[PDB]
Amino acid sequence: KPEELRQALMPTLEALYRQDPESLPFRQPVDPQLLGIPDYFDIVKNPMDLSTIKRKLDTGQYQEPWQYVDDVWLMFNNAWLYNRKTSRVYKFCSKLAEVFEQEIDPVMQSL
Amino acid sequence: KKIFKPEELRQALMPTLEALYRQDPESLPFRQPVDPQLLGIPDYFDIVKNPMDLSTIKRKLDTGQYQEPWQYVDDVWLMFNNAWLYNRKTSRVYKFCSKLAEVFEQEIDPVMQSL
Ligand SMILES: COC(=O)N1CCCc2cc(NC(=O)[C@@H]3CC=CC[C@@H]3C(=O)O)ccc21
Ligand code: NA
Ligand code: NA
Ligand code: NA
Ligand code: NA
């Protein structure tokens, strides 16, 4: 059931929000104009961020855990792609990806 | 937006994929589709809902299944994503996966910067 999924997945997501500073650039959608990065949507075809994932989860749009996971991977993949390995966002992203693997694994298990 | 005809797309992307494939030994567990019967991990398919591997990606590229670069990148990520999820951070194959990510990132960057 939707709330059953939401209850099982939401802590996963909260684990991502609560990483300071690492989640700071992932909490809103990337604004290429406002960030001065006009080539963003030339490289990143399908953007994803924490606010978007939360809104989908909150509103029943993942019928199955793996679809939720796909959107979290997409968010990491877009950031590793666009950003330099040396950059702040790229390393924040790496941190969040470890936090996410750690939390998502036993949730998939009991689910 | 560069528009890439099918042959251009192949010659822009194919060196990306050869780069992964010659990674020895890191690419070996990635050359063929994970066989959960062979390997005894038949809960692989309970965790990995859409499998992906080098042989599949080469077939999709060889048979015109990609029109733009981001679609081939999606599949490359999907192969890495599956392996990071299923494997433990401590395993040989998970560490293989990240080495392959590093290589793929270096190789595809010039492609992404040209579009
Ligand atoms: C992408 O890989 C995976 O996620 N799995 C899940 C668990 C570990 C795993 C092991 C193998 N076996 C091997 O690598 C074999 C021994 C060492 C060299 C290559 C051999 C081969 O089989 O060619 C294949 C696939 C996966
Ligand atoms: Na990582
Ligand atoms: Na990772
Ligand atoms: Na990586
Ligand atoms: Na990475």
Peptide bond into B25 cis (omega under 30): yes
Nearest to B112 by CA among A33, A83, A111, A61: A83
Tokens of A23: 């989640």
Tell me how far apart the terminal alpha carbons of chain B are, to the nearest angstrom. Answer: 5
* Interatomic CA distance for residues A69 and A53, integer angstroms: 10
CA distance B72 to chain A (A): 12
Nearest to B13 by CA among B28, B2, B25, B24: B2
* Interatomic CA distance for residues A92 and A23, integer angstroms: 7
Output the CA B18–ligand 2 centroid distance in Å: 23
| Half-sphere exposure of residue A87: CA atoms within 13 angstroms, side-chain side | 10
Tokens of A77: 């993949």
Q: Which amino acid is at B77?
A: W
CA distance B70 to chain A (A): 7
* Count of beta carbons in the 10 Å neighbourhood of residue A2: 13
* Count of beta carbons in the 10 Å neighbourhood of residue A42: 17
C-beta of residue B53 within 8 angstroms of C-beta of residue B88: no
Tokens of B85: 């999820």
C-beta of residue A27 within 8 angstroms of C-beta of residue A50: yes
How many helical (H) and strand (E) elements, i.e. helices and strands, does chain A have?
Answer: 6, 0
**Cβ neighbours for A66, distance < 8 A, ≥ 6 positions apart:** B49, B50
For B67-91, give one letter per residue: b (16+ CB within 10 A) or e.
eebbebbbbbbbbbbbbbbbbeeee
Nearest to B88 by CA among A109, A107, A15, A102: A102
Nearest to A88 by CA among A37, A27, A39, A24: A24
Nearest to B57 by CA among B48, B66, B44: B66
Spacing of C-alpha B115 from chain mean position: 20
What is the sign of the dihedral through the CA atoms of B52, A17, A64 and B65?
negative
| Nearest alpha carbon, ligand 1 atom 10 | B29
Contacts with A43 from chain B: Cβ below 8 Å: 70, 112, 115
Contacts with A85 from chain B: Cβ below 8 Å: 102, 105
Cβ-Cβ contacts under 8 Å between A and B: the total is: 38
CB contact under 8 A, B112 and A81: yes
* Interatomic CA distance for residues B113 and B115, integer angstroms: 6
What is the DSSP secondary structure assignment for residue A106, as one 8-state letter? Answer: H
Resolution (A): 2.5
What is the sign of the dihedral through the CA atoms of A65, A67, A68 and A70?
positive
Q: Which amino acid is at B34?
A: V
Residue with tokens 């961020």: A49
* Interatomic CA distance for residues B7 and A20, integer angstroms: 46
What is the experimental method? X-ray
Which ligand 1 atom is the nearest neighbour of the CA of B53? Answer: 1
Output the CA A96–ligand 4 centroid distance in Å: 13
CB contact under 8 A, A80 and B105: yes
Output the CA A97–ligand 2 centroid distance in Å: 5
CA torsion angle B19 B23 B27 B32 (round to 10): 60
Of the candidates A43, A46, A101, the beta carbon closest to that of B84 is on A101
* Interatomic CA distance for residues B35 and B52, integer angstroms: 12
* Interatomic CA distance for residues B5 and B53, integer angstroms: 24
C-beta of residue A65 within 8 angstroms of C-beta of residue A111: yes
* Count of beta carbons in the 10 Å neighbourhood of residue A47: 16
